[PDB]
Amino acid sequence: TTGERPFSDIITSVRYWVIHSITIPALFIAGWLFVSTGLAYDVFGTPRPDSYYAQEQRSIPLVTDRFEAKQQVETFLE
Amino acid sequence: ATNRDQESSGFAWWAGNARLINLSGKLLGAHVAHAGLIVFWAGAMTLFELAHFIPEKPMYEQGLILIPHIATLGWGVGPGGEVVDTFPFFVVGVVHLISSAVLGFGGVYHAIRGPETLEEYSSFFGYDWKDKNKMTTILGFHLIVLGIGALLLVAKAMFFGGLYDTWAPGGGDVRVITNPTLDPRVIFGYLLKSPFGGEGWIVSVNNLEDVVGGHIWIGLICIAGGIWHILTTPFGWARRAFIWSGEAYLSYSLGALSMMGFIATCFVWFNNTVYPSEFYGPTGPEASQAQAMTFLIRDQKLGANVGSAQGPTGLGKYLMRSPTGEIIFGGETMRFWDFRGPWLEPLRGPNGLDLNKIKNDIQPWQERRAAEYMTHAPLGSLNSVGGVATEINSVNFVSPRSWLATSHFVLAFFFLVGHLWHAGRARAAAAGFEKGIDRESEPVLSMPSLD
Amino acid sequence: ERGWFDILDDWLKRDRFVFVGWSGILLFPCAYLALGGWLTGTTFVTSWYTHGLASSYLEGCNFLTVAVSTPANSMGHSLLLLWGPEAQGDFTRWCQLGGLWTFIALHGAFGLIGFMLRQFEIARLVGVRPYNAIAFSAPIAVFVSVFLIYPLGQSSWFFAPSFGVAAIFRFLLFFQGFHNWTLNPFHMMGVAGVLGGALLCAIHGATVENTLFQDGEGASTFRAFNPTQAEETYSMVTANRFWSQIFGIAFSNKRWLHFFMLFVPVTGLWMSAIGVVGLALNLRSYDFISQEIRAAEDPEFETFYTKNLLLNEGIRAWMAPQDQPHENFVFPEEVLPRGNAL
Amino acid sequence: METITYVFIFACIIALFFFAIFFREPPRI
Amino acid sequence: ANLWERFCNWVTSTDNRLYVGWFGVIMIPTLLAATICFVIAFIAAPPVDIDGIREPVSGSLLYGNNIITGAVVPSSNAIGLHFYPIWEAASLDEWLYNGGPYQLIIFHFLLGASCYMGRQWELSYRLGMRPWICVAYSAPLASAFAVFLIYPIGQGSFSDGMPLGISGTFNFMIVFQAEHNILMHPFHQLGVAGVFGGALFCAMHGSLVTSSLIRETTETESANYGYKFGQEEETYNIVAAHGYFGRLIFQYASFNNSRSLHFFLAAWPVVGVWFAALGISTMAFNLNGFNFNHSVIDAKGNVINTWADIINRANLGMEVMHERNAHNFPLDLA
Amino acid sequence: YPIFTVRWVAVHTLAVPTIFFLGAIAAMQFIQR
Amino acid sequence: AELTPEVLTVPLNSEGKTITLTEKQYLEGKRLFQYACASCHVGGITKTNPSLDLRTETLALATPPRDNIEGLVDYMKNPTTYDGEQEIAEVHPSLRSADIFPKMRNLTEKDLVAIAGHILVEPKILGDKWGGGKVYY
Numbered sequence A: 001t002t003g004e005r006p007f008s009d010i011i012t013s014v015r016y017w018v019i020h021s022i023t024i025p026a027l028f029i030a031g032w033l034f035v036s037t038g039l040a041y042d043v044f045g046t047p048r049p050d051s052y053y054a055q056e057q058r059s060i061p062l063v064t065d066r067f068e069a070k071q072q073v074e075t076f077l078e
Numbered sequence B: 001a002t003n004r005d006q007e008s009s010g011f012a013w014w015a016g017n018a019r020l021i022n023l024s025g026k027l028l029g030a031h032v033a034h035a036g037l038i039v040f041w042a043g044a045m046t047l048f049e050l051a052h053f054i055p056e057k058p059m060y061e062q063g064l065i066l067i068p069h070i071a072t073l074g075w076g077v078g079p080g081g082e083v084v085d086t087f088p089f090f091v092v093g094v095v096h097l098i099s100s101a102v103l104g105f106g107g108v109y110h111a112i113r114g115p116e117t118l119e120e121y122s123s124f125f126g127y128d129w130k131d132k133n134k135m136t137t138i139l140g141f142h143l144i145v146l147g148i149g150a151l152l153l154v155a156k157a158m159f160f161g162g163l164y165d166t167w168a169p170g171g172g173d174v175r176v177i178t179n180p181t182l183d184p185r186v187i188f189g190y191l192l193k194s195p196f197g198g199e200g201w202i203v204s205v206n207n208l209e210d211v212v213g214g215h216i217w218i219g220l221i222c223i224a225g226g227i228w229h230i231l232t233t234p235f236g237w238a239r240r241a242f243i244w245s246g247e248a249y250l251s252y253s254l255g256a257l258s259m260m261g262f263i264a265t266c267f268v269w270f271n272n273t274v275y276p277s278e279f280y281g282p283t284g285p286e287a288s289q290a291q292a293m294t295f296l297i298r299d300q301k302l303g304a305n306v307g308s309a310q311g312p313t314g315l316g317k318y319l320m321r322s323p324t325g326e327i328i329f330g331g332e333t334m335r336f337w338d339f340r341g342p343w344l345e346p347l348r349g350p351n352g353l354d355l356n357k358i359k360n361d362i363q364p365w366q367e368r369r370a371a372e373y374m375t376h377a378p379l380g381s382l383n384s385v386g387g388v389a390t391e392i393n394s395v396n397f398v399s400p401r402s403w404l405a406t407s408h409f410v411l412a413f414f415f416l417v418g419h420l421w422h423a424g425r426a427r428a429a430a431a432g433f434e435k436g437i438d439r440e441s442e443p444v445l446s447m448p449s450l451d
Numbered sequence C: 001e002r003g004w005f006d007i008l009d010d011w012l013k014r015d016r017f018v019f020v021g022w023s024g025i026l027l028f029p030c031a032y033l034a035l036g037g038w039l040t041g042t043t044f045v046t047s048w049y050t051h052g053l054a055s056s057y058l059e060g061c062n063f064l065t066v067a068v069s070t071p072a073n074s075m076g077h078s079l080l081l082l083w084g085p086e087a088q089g090d091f092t093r094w095c096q097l098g099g100l101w102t103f104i105a106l107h108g109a110f111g112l113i114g115f116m117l118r119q120f121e122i123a124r125l126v127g128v129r130p131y132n133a134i135a136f137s138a139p140i141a142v143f144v145s146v147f148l149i150y151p152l153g154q155s156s157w158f159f160a161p162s163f164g165v166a167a168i169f170r171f172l173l174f175f176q177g178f179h180n181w182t183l184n185p186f187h188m189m190g191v192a193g194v195l196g197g198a199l200l201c202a203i204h205g206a207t208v209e210n211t212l213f214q215d216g217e218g219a220s221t222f223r224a225f226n227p228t229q230a231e232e233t234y235s236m237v238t239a240n241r242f243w244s245q246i247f248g249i250a251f252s253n254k255r256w257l258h259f260f261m262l263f264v265p266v267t268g269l270w271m272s273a274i275g276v277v278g279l280a281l282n283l284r285s286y287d288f289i290s291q292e293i294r295a296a297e298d299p300e301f302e303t304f305y306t307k308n309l310l311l312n313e314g315i316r317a318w319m320a321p322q323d324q325p326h327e328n329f330v331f332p333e334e335v336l337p338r339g340n341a342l
Numbered sequence D: 001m002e003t004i005t006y007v008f009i010f011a012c013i014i015a016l017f018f019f020a021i022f023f024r025e026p027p028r029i
Numbered sequence E: 001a002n003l004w005e006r007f008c009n010w011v012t013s014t015d016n017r018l019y020v021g022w023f024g025v026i027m028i029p030t031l032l033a034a035t036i037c038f039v040i041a042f043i044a045a046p047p048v049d050i051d052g053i054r055e056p057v058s059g060s061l062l063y064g065n066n067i068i069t070g071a072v073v074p075s076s077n078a079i080g081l082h083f084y085p086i087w088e089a090a091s092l093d094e095w096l097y098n099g100g101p102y103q104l105i106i107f108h109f110l111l112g113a114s115c116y117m118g119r120q121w122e123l124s125y126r127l128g129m130r131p132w133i134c135v136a137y138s139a140p141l142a143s144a145f146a147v148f149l150i151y152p153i154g155q156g157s158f159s160d161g162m163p164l165g166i167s168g169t170f171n172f173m174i175v176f177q178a179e180h181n182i183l184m185h186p187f188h189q190l191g192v193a194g195v196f197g198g199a200l201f202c203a204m205h206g207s208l209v210t211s212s213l214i215r216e217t218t219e220t221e222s223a224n225y226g227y228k229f230g231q232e233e234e235t236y237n238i239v240a241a242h243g244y245f246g247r248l249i250f251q252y253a254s255f256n257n258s259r260s261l262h263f264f265l266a267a268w269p270v271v272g273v274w275f276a277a278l279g280i281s282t283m284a285f286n287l288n289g290f291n292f293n294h295s296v297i298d299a300k301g302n303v304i305n306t307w308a309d310i311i312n313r314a315n316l317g318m319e320v321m322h323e324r325n326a327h328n329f330p331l332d333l334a
Numbered sequence F: 001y002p003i004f005t006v007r008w009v010a011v012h013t014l015a016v017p018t019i020f021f022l023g024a025i026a027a028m029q030f031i032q033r
Numbered sequence G: 001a002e003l004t005p006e007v008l009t010v011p012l013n014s015e016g017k018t019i020t021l022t023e024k025q026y027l028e029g030k031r032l033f034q035y036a037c038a039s040c041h042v043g044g045i046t047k048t049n050p051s052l053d054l055r056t057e058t059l060a061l062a063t064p065p066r067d068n069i070e071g072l073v074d075y076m077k078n079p080t081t082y083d084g085e086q087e088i089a090e091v092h093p094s095l096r097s098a099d100i101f102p103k104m105r106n107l108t109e110k111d112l113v114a115i116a117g118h119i120l121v122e123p124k125i126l127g128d129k130w131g132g133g134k135v136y137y
């Protein structure tokens, strides 16, 4: 009894569904594409399945230098 | 909408089925529809198992629990548990699936369309929970039905092709039981066996003659008792001992199913006669023994004298004594020396494992079975990675014995809880205080102080 | 209704679906960012560069194995600010260096401050005593001791817990093998307050539900109560008699009962927090000296205490090379402690 | 001396249980 | 009335300081026997060959333990699930070496605690109470059955039952983690939610009721004197408490119905602990925690470790070290 | 009834990213190494 | 890193001839090794006889040599002890013992090649983890 429209009124109204039958699927498709385009890997710097190791390297690219860690990751990525 | 809200029935939606206690027609609907659910799952599950089934792999590598039940009855299988014909499996699945439509039909009809109460309509089908005579009569009918079910198993074993016998001389095979055990000293002797190790109460049954014989007794006992209950009314001492109400009777049956659920759990875990290891995988005890046997065979092939080989502790690395002197496998499997199985028994003599037989008579088929059982031990993860908990992914395996024991322990436990719930509710309701304490008649206020 | 301060105060304190308050200005952004940083990291962010682990749904982990992991040991106790000297404003690199860890831990810390200020604020407006805020000091002591003090006493944030289901399981096992934390009497007091609290929760709920007055006709008894009713809904007198006779003692004072329900778990969590402050310094209850002196001189003397240190020794040697990759441990097979066969 | 101490504290607690039960402040309505 | 009738009247009397009852007729002697044997063994029992390898473990105070390390040690792995009462032994000295006290204690205790639960039903019936306090107690009781009876049954030996001691308990937990990965089992996770949530809601309820106590005392008196045993009127304002808590979260997240609130307080920890108990009772039959060891693999086939693999390494340390002289063959299969 | 309340904002700060994330995670179920 | 033609190129015979397996054959080999062999040989060890593993260097020193497709295919038809001295079909799965090891009954020549190919490729991916046992988990 704080004023706002009751949730049960909103989610059973035709107009809620007209707005949301477009916004909900649009958001979901945008999330889908953020991954399917590969963009998620690049924003966050997460390795793709082919990018954890070089072909013959077999030690992990562990960061070992506090202030030049950013440079280490850049060289590791080289 | 007769009795289909809280106001009129006294029961909230989440206790809605309690609205049925005195509506025998709709309650019969609920019961018949539910029997259709059971029969449905049995038929659909069997067809699913059959559709997935690769006959040359062990059943126990395939997540099967129903085909193993059918195979044990001697359908579909030959020597060693080799699958010779999947058609009996198909028949079992289809007949249950078809039958469930009939029960589902009756269930929906009674629940939704038929008379809500049966008492007006019929005095034979109507009932009052408080009518002790009608209660024992219906109980008698069901006892006769159950007795006939028990004799159907005897009929299979004796007249319709036999049962799978893991103990058959020369190797596991389907065998017709011609000499079932009738001696009450053997049959009822099992019931007085200790449930502790080396004894195992009824779980110890180790031959099909005792199994068949017990069902001869049980079929007769149930039929006789069922007749008895149709023709008698409870004695006075019975009348004074029990609560007589629908909820009370539900509670007694909940206790009994809980007990049976625990018994089944131990049966599938330990017994390899009515749960042949050919179909269900090795028992935990069996796989542990099979590992010791494996390495004894290996190392003796390498030249070890396994009788005289002292392990790190001073006990024999391969062979030691049980606390009563019998020769048994050593290492941790010392705990499992009560284990008995067809691949090991040929090596056991009157003093336990026989060293002469071990040195000279172990056959390649015993080496194979022991390797198979060691590597199919019933250990595995919830996502079905077979092996100890530290195992890497590769082997997709959880034993049918683990699935069946765990499920039934869970069910048996919650059935004990439902027993307490309903038994305690039935007592309170019969005495009139299940809805709370009367504020003007609070028993404790009329009692003397404790101090 | 005066100056802007008092107009802002009015609006902040409106009676709405989600109360805001002055505390809301700290709470909402901090709780939102802690939770969103957790969902963002577990969904998209690796731990390859800090731990050599995959840790996100993106890389293939499930709800049990995802985490936002701590930064590399070389980061020490860096605040690891986005604009700081390590990431220098590069968002991608900051994610790869474990910046989301300190982001979550620090927003989470300020958020808990805001939640507790919210408890005080709402209590003051509604006119109740602020015991809920007081009780919440136990969650605060636990969060601060385990997520801030513990790693501050150790070499780096690397050894804080990582924010994940399996990551936290790993943290428990590490504390067993390295700190023998089960032996610690401050942890034992925590366990007593948690299990004793769960005990009080269960037994008090069951007792009320089973000593209820019949206040309606329904066999479902929940409708037979009214919030504004003057009367107790259940019989303290009958409840007291029942427990006095079953267990020997019983509550008779409802006020004491409810205070004790605050006291037990709040006190147990505060005790566990003190033990963790000691573990920040490796100041463990690891050993009983008299046990070791005896066992060293007497190879036939064995207790469950000596059995558990053998397990700890296994945990340390087997887990350390992959759990502490900055150490570059190489332990040849021949040096690993193992019993026979296994 | 340690065994004596542990058993003594334990015995005090069992005595305490006896008094707390049989010599409690009686509950009064 | 006759002797029997008076006896029955006394056994079932609502007037005894401690209720006796029919469950109590079994509970009293069984709990007494378990208690006396436990106390004597914990002080004075000699070392016990728990793992059947002639390597006796000292549990008692007089043989070099303190309160934290002491235990009554489980019975010998050579016994397995065999019933080992005193009269099965050639002497008390043999019975002690083989961990006889453990069996005597746990069987009498389980019987007695089961009767404790029946007695709770029994008295509630004598008092005209609703009957389900005994159902709340089934949760801790089921958990004691899991660790002292069901687990040994599954694994084939009481030597794998939980020891009766503080350090023995931790030993049982650590070995259980090695062998079942319990932490990764959802039933143990539900138990954690049950006990952490039970503690949380305990503190919540204590604090909400305490916060809304009606002023009945002065500042120099404990507020507890504001309540009198057996008074009719509720001692706090639930509407005030709900008004606070509905605002802390949002209105519909708070109970204003005391009956619903107290039912939730019962149910949450009781259901969680039932799942804890069923976790142990089903890992008894080796249906174990989720195994994601090497679940994540890169494009070439390199294993990319996750936190699950690091758990695995800790589990391996427990596994290889536990019972270091008891395994001769490469798999630990119980 | 007003449309755009504190509550409305609260709901969308959570609901909006939730749906976007759920689409991202659904897409992940089809990634092969 | 990738599963390349090069990683997939293994010894065909004892004379140094190689064969490059397809990715489909690699998948098939893992699948069939799981189907018929992993219950004892998970991760390249041997559960019922830990002294003998599936490492390539171990296979090379077997008699006849088993570190190539031909020696492995022949092993699956007629397995021997490590010195070549006894035929062990009666206790080890093989085509000649498909009667008693029924999972061998519908393995084709093509399937044996894929399994042999798995055994050689896997240590090229996993290194010492293949045949290493729990130490390398």
Ligand code: CLA
Pocket: B002, B003, B004, B005, B012, B013, B014, B015, B016, B017, B018, B019, B020, B023, B026, B027, B029, B030, B031, B033, B034, B101, B104, B105, B108, B111, B112
């Ligand atoms: C095995 C599960 C089961 C069964 C067999 C029943 C049976 C029944 N319940 Mg219970 N119930 C259940 C589970 C079940 N319930 C659960 C899980 C809950 C909690 C959600 C409830 C809560 C509940 C309440 C609150 C009430 C009942 C009531 C009833 C009865 C009247 C139903 C009615 O009025 O339908 C009206 C519904 C319809 C007309 C919709 C269609 C229903 C049919 C049966 C669907 C059948 C579908 C099936 C695929 C058809 C196959 C046909 C084919 C073979 C030809 C009926 C006997 C009522 C009662 O007791 O009346 C006296 C009542 O008030 N139930």
Ligand code: CLA
Pocket: B041, B048, B049, B052, B062, B063, B064, B065, B382, B384, B400, B403, B404, B407, B408, B410, B414, E271
């Ligand atoms: C006795 C019951 C039982 C048992 C022992 C099994 C056993 C098995 N099933 Mg079958 N099955 C069952 C009933 C059972 N099922 C039912 C009711 C269905 C219909 C849904 C199926 C449908 C089915 C399919 C479609 C498949 C199986 C398969 C399997 C195998 C793998 C199972 C798995 O991976 O679990 C995974 C484990 C879980 C999903 C966890 C379940 C845990 C529940 C939710 C907890 C229960 C708690 C309690 C009951 C709730 C009470 C609440 C409390 C407050 C009172 C295994 C042999 C698979 C197979 O290999 O077939 C060849 C397979 O594909 N089953």
Ligand code: CLA
Pocket: B028, B032, B102, B103, B105, B106, B107, B109, B110, B114, B115, B118, B121, B122, B125
């Ligand atoms: C245990 C289950 C059960 C019980 C106690 C009842 C009882 C009743 N039924 Mg319901 N019903 C059931 C199941 C049941 N039915 C099933 C499965 C179906 C779907 C086929 C129906 C469909 C149904 C309809 C459509 C009607 C009834 C009616 C009736 C009433 C009269 C029956 C009669 O006059 O006998 C007559 C009996 C015979 C002529 C002999 C029956 C021969 C049987 C089939 C052979 C028995 C073999 C064996 C024991 C069966 C084993 C089954 C098991 C394996 C599952 C009575 C209240 C009527 C009613 O409600 O009137 C208003 C009504 O119209 N039933």
Ligand code: CLA
Pocket: B136, B139, B143, B191, B192, B221, B222, B223, B224, B225, B226, B228, B232, B233, B234, B235, B238, B241
């Ligand atoms: C589902 C099956 C079932 C059910 C629910 C009933 C129910 C009933 N029976 Mg019937 N009965 C049945 C099957 C059944 N019976 C069969 C198959 C037969 C033929 C053998 C009988 C022969 C029979 C007779 C001769 C009598 C009853 C009587 C009764 C009534 C009271 C029973 C009682 O007090 O038991 C409780 C049991 C006792 C009080 C015995 C003492 C308690 C002991 C010590 C318990 C020990 C068990 C323990 C848990 C160990 C289990 C393992 C064990 C095998 C070693 C009640 C209506 C009585 C009656 O009123 O007739 C009208 C009566 O005199 N029944």
Ligand code: CLA
Pocket: C025, C026, C029, C030, C033, C079, C080, C081, C082, C083, C099, C102, C103, C104, C106, C107, C110
């Ligand atoms: C009440 C809300 C609140 C609080 C308490 C915090 C707190 C924090 N944030 Mg978070 N943040 C918030 C809201 C908040 N944030 C919002 C709404 C966003 C979205 C924009 C963010 C996004 C965010 C990011 C991306 C990061 C943080 C980081 C931080 C940490 C370092 C902050 C810092 O050093 O500021 C220093 C600034 C102040 C203390 C303001 C002081 C104002 C004084 C009193 C007046 C002086 C002003 C002066 C006149 C200006 C002259 C400057 C001139 C010389 C150029 C700290 C835990 C960092 C972190 O977590 O690293 C791990 C980090 O990287 N925040």
Ligand SMILES: CC1=C(/C=C/C(C)=C/C=C/C(C)=C/C=C/C=C(C)/C=C/C=C(C)/C=C/C2=C(C)CCCC2(C)C)C(C)(C)CCC1
Pocket: B029, B030, B033, B034, B036, B037, B040, B047, B094, B097, B098, B100, B101, B103, B104, B105, B107, B108, B111
């Ligand atoms: C009452 C009620 C209820 C319940 C109900 C029920 C429980 C019912 C049942 C039902 C049932 C129980 C049904 C069944 C059905 C069945 C069917 C319908 C079948 C069919 C089949 C077929 C068609 C087959 C086919 C085939 C063949 C022949 C061969 C192979 C292949 C195939 C499979 C395809 C509820 C809960 C809702 C609630 C409300 C009330």
Ligand SMILES: CC1=C(/C=C/C(C)=C/C=C/C(C)=C/C=C/C=C(C)/C=C/C=C(C)/C=C/C2=C(C)CCCC2(C)C)C(C)(C)CCC1
Pocket: B186, B187, B188, B190, B191, B202, B205, B210, B211, B212, B213, B214, B215, B217, B218, B241, B242
């Ligand atoms: C088939 C078979 C067999 C056989 C079997 C048999 C023969 C059985 C029988 C069984 C029986 C014959 C059982 C019985 C049971 C009983 C019971 C289970 C009882 C119960 C009781 C009760 C429950 C009671 C109660 C009470 C009391 C106690 C007190 C008072 C009150 C009252 C009444 C409540 C064998 C093993 C050979 C083999 C395999 C198969």
Ligand SMILES: CC1=C(/C=C/C(C)=C/C=C/C(C)=C/C=C/C=C(C)/C=C/C=C(C)/C=C/C2=C(C)CCCC2(C)C)C(C)(C)CCC1
Pocket: C032, C033, C035, C036, C037, C038, C039, C040, F013, F014, F017, F018, F021, F022
């Ligand atoms: C970090 C960061 C940030 C922030 C961010 C954020 C704020 C985010 C948010 C985010 C979010 C906000 C997200 C969300 C997500 C969600 C999700 C992902 C969900 C899921 C769910 C599910 C899956 C469900 C499940 C379940 C349950 C829970 C129970 C019941 C049943 C079921 C199973 C259904 C910024 C920009 C400042 C910058 C720096 C960094």
Ligand SMILES: CCCCCCCS[C@@H]1O[C@H](CO)[C@@H](O)[C@H](O)[C@H]1O
Pocket: B075, B159, B160, B161
């Ligand atoms: C419920 C109806 C099921 C029909 C029963 C089918 C009989 S079963 C059938 O019986 C033969 C002997 O006549 C056996 O030799 C054969 O192996 C067996 O499968």
Ligand SMILES: CCCCCCCS[C@@H]1O[C@H](CO)[C@@H](O)[C@H](O)[C@H]1O
Pocket: C002, C003, C004, C005
């Ligand atoms: C957010 C912290 C703000 C601290 C308050 C600063 C006092 S500001 C204060 O506000 C008055 C309103 O009565 C004005 O009339 C007055 O001019 C001004 O001094």
Ligand code: OEX
Pocket: B332, E051, E077, E155, E159, E160, E175, E179, E322, E323, E326, E332, E333, E334
């Ligand atoms: O005992 Mn006690 O612990 Ca159950 O695993 Mn096997 O056994 Mn022994 O090893 Mn691991």
Ligand SMILES: [Ca+2]
Pocket: E299, F033, G002, G003
């Ligand atoms: Ca590729």
Ligand SMILES: [Cl-]
Pocket: C307, E171, E175, E321, E322, E323, E324
């Ligand atoms: Cl140990």
Ligand SMILES: [Cl-]
Pocket: B330, B331, B332, B333, E326, E327, E328, E329
């Ligand atoms: Cl062993």
Ligand SMILES: [Fe+2]
Pocket: C204, C208, E205, E209
């Ligand atoms: Fe309360």
